[PDB]
Amino acid sequence: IVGGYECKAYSQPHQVSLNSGYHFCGGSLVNENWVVSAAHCYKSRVAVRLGEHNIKVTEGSEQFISSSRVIRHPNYSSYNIDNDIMLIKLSKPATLNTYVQPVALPSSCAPAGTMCTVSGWGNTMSSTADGDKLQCLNIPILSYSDCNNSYPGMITNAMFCAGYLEGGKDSCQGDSGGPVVCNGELQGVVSWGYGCAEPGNPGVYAKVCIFNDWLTSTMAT
Numbered sequence: 728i729v730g731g732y733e734c735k736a737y738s739q740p741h742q743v744s745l746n747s748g749y750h751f752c753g754g755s756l757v758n759e760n761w762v763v764s765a766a767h768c769y770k771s772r773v774a775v776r777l778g779e780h781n782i783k784v785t786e787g788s789e790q791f792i793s794s795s796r797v798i799r800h801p802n803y804s805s806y807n808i809d810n811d812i813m814l815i816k817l818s819k820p821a822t823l824n825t826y827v828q829p830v831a832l833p834s835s836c837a838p839a840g841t842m843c844t845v846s847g848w849g850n851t852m853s854s855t856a857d858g859d860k861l862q863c864l865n866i867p868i869l870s871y872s873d874c875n876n877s878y879p880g881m882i883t884n885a886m887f888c889a890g891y892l893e894g895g896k897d898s899c900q901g902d903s904g905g906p907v908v909c910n911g912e913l914q915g916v917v918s919w920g921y922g923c924a925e926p927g928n929p930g931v932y933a934k935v936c937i938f939n940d941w942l943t944s945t946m947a948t
C-alpha cells in the first residue's frame with residue numbers, strides 16, 4: 728500500500744496473509760471456512776495467517792491455518808489477468824473472535840464515486856510507511872470511462888479501477904489478493920496495474936459483485 732496509513736490494529740479482521748515461507752499475497756475471510764483472494768496468487772498449498780497486524784512479530788492474535796483446497800476461477804485467464812479471483816478453503820475452521828471476523832460479500836455492485844478501503848502488507852514505496860504493519864488506504868471507485876482511458880481495451884466486465892489518476896496513493900505488489908471494502912462489504916480484490924501509484928495508472932481490481940453465484944456455489948461444494 729503506497730500513500731496510505733497504518734491501519735488501526737485489527738480494524739480489518741477479514742484481512743489474511745498468504746504465506747509460503749514469507750508473505751506473498753493478501754486475502755479476505757468470507758466465513759469460518761473460506762478465503763477470497765486473487766487467482767494470480769495461486770499455489771497448490773498455502774498457509775493462511777489470520778488475526779495479523781505485524782506479520783513480523785508474534786502478537787498472540789494470530790491463527791495459522793493451512794489450506795485444504797485452492798480453487799482458481801474457471802474462467803481465469805493470465806494473459807490479461809481477467810477473472811482474477813480465487814477461493815481458498817481452510818483445512819480447519821477459523822475461530823471467530825476479536826481478531827478474526829469475516830467480511831460480507833456484496834449485495835450488489837458499487838458505482839463509480841464510492842469511497843472504499845483497501846489494505847495489505849505490500850510494497851509502500853516509502854521510507855516512512857512500514858509495510859510490516861497492515862496498511863490502509865481510502866480509494867474511490869473510478870468511472871469505466873476513466874478506467875478504460877487509462878488502459879485502452881484492457882478492462883473487462885470482471886474489473887473496475889479504484890484510486891487516484893493523480894498518483895501517490897494505490898495498492899501494490901504484495902497487496903495482491905487483498906480486500907477492497909466499500910461500506911462494509913467486499914467489492915474488490917487487489918489484482919493489477921502498471922507500476923504503483925503512478926499518474927494515469929490507477930489500481931485495477933477484480934469485481935467481486937459479479938462472482939456471487941460462483942462464490943456461493945463453490946463454497947457450498
Ligand SMILES: [Ca+2]
Pocket residue numbers: 779780781782783784785786789
Ligand atoms: Ca503478527
